[PDB]
Amino acid sequence: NKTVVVTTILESPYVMMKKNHEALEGNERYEGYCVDLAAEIAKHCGFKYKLTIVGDGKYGARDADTKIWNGMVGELVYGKADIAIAPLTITLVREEVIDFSKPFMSLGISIMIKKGTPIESAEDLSKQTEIAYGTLDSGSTKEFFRRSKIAVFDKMWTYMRSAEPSVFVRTTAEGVARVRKSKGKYAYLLESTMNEYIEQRKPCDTMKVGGNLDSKGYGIATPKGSSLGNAVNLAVLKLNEQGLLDKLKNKWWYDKGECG
Amino acid sequence: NKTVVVTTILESPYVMMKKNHEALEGNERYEGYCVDLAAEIAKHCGFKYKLTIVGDGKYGARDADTKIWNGMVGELVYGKADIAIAPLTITLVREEVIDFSKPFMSLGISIMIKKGTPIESAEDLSKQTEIAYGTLDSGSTKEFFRRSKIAVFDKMWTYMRSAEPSVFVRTTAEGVARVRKSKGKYAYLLESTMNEYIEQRKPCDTMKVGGNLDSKGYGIATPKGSSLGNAVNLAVLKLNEQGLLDKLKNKWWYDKGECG
Numbered sequence: 001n002k003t004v005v006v007t008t009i010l011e012s013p014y015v016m017m018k019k020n021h022e023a024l025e026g027n028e029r030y031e032g033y034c035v036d037l038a039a040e041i042a043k044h045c046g047f048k049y050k051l052t053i054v055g056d057g058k059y060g061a062r063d064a065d066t067k068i069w070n071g072m073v074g075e076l077v078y079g080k081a082d083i084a085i086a087p088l089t090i091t092l093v094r095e096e097v098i099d100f101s102k103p104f105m106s107l108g109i110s111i112m113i114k115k116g117t118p119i120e121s122a123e124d125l126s127k128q129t130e131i132a133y134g135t136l137d138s139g140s141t142k143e144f145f146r147r148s149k150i151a152v153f154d155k156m157w158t159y160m161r162s163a164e165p166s167v168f169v170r171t172t173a174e175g176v177a178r179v180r181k182s183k184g185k186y187a188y189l190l191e192s193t194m195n196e197y198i199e200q201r202k203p204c205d206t207m208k209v210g211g212n213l214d215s216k217g218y219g220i221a222t223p224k225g226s227s228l229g230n231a232v233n234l235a236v237l238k239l240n241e242q243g244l245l246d247k248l249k250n251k252w253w254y255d256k257g258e259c260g
Numbered sequence: 261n262k263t264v265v266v267t268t269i270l271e272s273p274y275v276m277m278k279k280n281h282e283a284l285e286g287n288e289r290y291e292g293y294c295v296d297l298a299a300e301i302a303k304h305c306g307f308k309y310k311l312t313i314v315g316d317g318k319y320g321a322r323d324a325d326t327k328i329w330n331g332m333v334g335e336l337v338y339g340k341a342d343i344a345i346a347p348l349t350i351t352l353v354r355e356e357v358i359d360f361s362k363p364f365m366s367l368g369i370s371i372m373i374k375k376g377t378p379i380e381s382a383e384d385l386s387k388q389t390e391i392a393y394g395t396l397d398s399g400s401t402k403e404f405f406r407r408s409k410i411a412v413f414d415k416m417w418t419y420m421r422s423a424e425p426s427v428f429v430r431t432t433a434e435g436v437a438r439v440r441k442s443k444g445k446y447a448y449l450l451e452s453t454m455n456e457y458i459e460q461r462k463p464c465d466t467m468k469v470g471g472n473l474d475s476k477g478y479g480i481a482t483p484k485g486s487s488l489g490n491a492v493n494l495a496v497l498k499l500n501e502q503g504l505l506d507k508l509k510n511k512w513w514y515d516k517g518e519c520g
């Protein structure tokens with residue numbers, strides 16, 4: 001009937017501007033895991049779509065005062081977009097206002113260190129102060145620590161929320177740059193699949209250490225009651241069962257890995 | 261309003277008969293990961309329930325001729341039970357007839373060998389014939405191979421469906437017993453979390469080898485349109501975010517591990 005508005009976010013390798021995007025237009029301007037996923041979802045659900053980058057560049061959180069939802073979640077809640085296809089974490093608070101398909105990717109919070117840093121776990125981080133550590137300034141990773149009642153994670157949150165200077169960063173790129181330029185005095189807490197991706201990128205000076213702190217997944221989101229919800233959910237299950245999601249990860253993570 | 265009928269299956273350590281069940285009655289007769297999960301789900305959703313073991317002892321498949329659904333899926337489809345709480349895999353074909361909550365456990369098909377067996381991957385298995393291998397005779401693991409278009413898995417299915425004697429087993433216990441009693445001439449393909457569980461059970465003679473063949477999850481199921489669906493889904497997300505699901509796995513898998 002009508003072209004579906006897809007909201008997504010510039011997060012490598014999910015969505016990236018093609019080198020020669022200027023010579024291109026529309027959906028052809030972008031490339032990445034979620035760009036490929038969107039094409040597959042649309043084909044299996046039978047709809048035409050337009051890729052758009054979330055206006056405020058955020059994932060989705062609710063302001064405690066205004067009660068307004070920002071980010072991709074907000075665009076769905078307010079009808080500015082019809083579906084969100086990005087590394088958007090399935091969480092309780094979001095599930096209450098929008099619908100999520102079954103997960104297309106499984107992950108967990110993990111630790112990124114510059115090679116050589118004497119840290120092997122969250123426990124290690126929480127028991128020392130020489131090495132600073134933080135998370136993305138907004139998102140499920142930060143919220144995980146803020147709301148955690150688990151001893152170690154609660155101790156980590158207490159340190160992070162009051163640390164000076166700030167240990168929180170605006171983007172993944174900033175967190176990675178901080179790890180790489182801090183001579184081992186900064187460790188970054190981020191979602192495991194991103195940690196895995198960066199570990200295979202030059203200058204190959206970072207690595208994931210320890211096990212994941214939690215377990216969760218990314219899901220495709222639609223406004224509550226959307227007529228696209230059901231088909232999208234089944235499409236995700238079909239793509240996973242056919243092994244296409246596994247193929248996409250290899251395509252964007254390892255096939256072109258730069259660290260051997 | 262009315263007591264919720266919960267259908268589940270006798271699969272250790274999800275649901276097991278307590279040693280002194282005779283002296284007990286009702287829900288108290290059972291113990292296990294899913295027994296604990298059911299209590300948590302009911303508490304968070306505010307309902308009273310009765311645990312029942314699926315009549316035909318199956319998970320859920322559709323007969324191609326009669327079109328009738330068997331197992332736990334069947335009990336939901338036909339209204340014999342109101343909710344299924346067990347290690348039930350979220351699959352496309354099932355999602356089409358019943359509703360699934362977001363996953364409460366992530367897993368994948370894996371290889372179980374008796375210690376010392378010269379096999380490290382699915383590739384290894386597919387390229388030889390001395391060592392037989394099979395799966396549970398019904399369920400998502402068998403279906404995975406039957407429907408797989410991936411070269412290695414397709415080759416494995418071709419061998420398994422025609423192997424003599426049969427390499428398929430009726431229950432997990434039978435598969436494990438066959439691995440343990442075949443002197444390394446039988447390898448068992450099963451869901452990873454079960455493989456992990458058995459590896460920590462006496463006589464400690466089995467082990468998981470290689471990476472998982474796929475990625476998926478178990479979900480709580482309800483009849484399509486059930487008024488319990490929404491609350492149950494949010495309950496699962498809440499329990500995971502609070503770290504309770506992680507605690508339950510440790511309780512039933514490692515806290516009482518028998519292999520050191």
Ligand SMILES: N[C@@H](Cn1cc(Br)c(=O)[nH]c1=O)C(=O)O
Binds near residue numbers: 090138139189
């Ligand atoms: N997926 C998160 C966003 N997000 C992303 C990355 Br990458 C990370 O390391 N941490 C996060 O919270 C959300 O949905 O808020």
Ligand SMILES: N[C@@H](Cn1cc(Br)c(=O)[nH]c1=O)C(=O)O
Binds near residue numbers: 451
């Ligand atoms: N979870 C499956 C059943 N199931 C269980 C175990 Br344990 C296994 O090794 N393989 C399966 O197919 C389903 O839902 O069919």
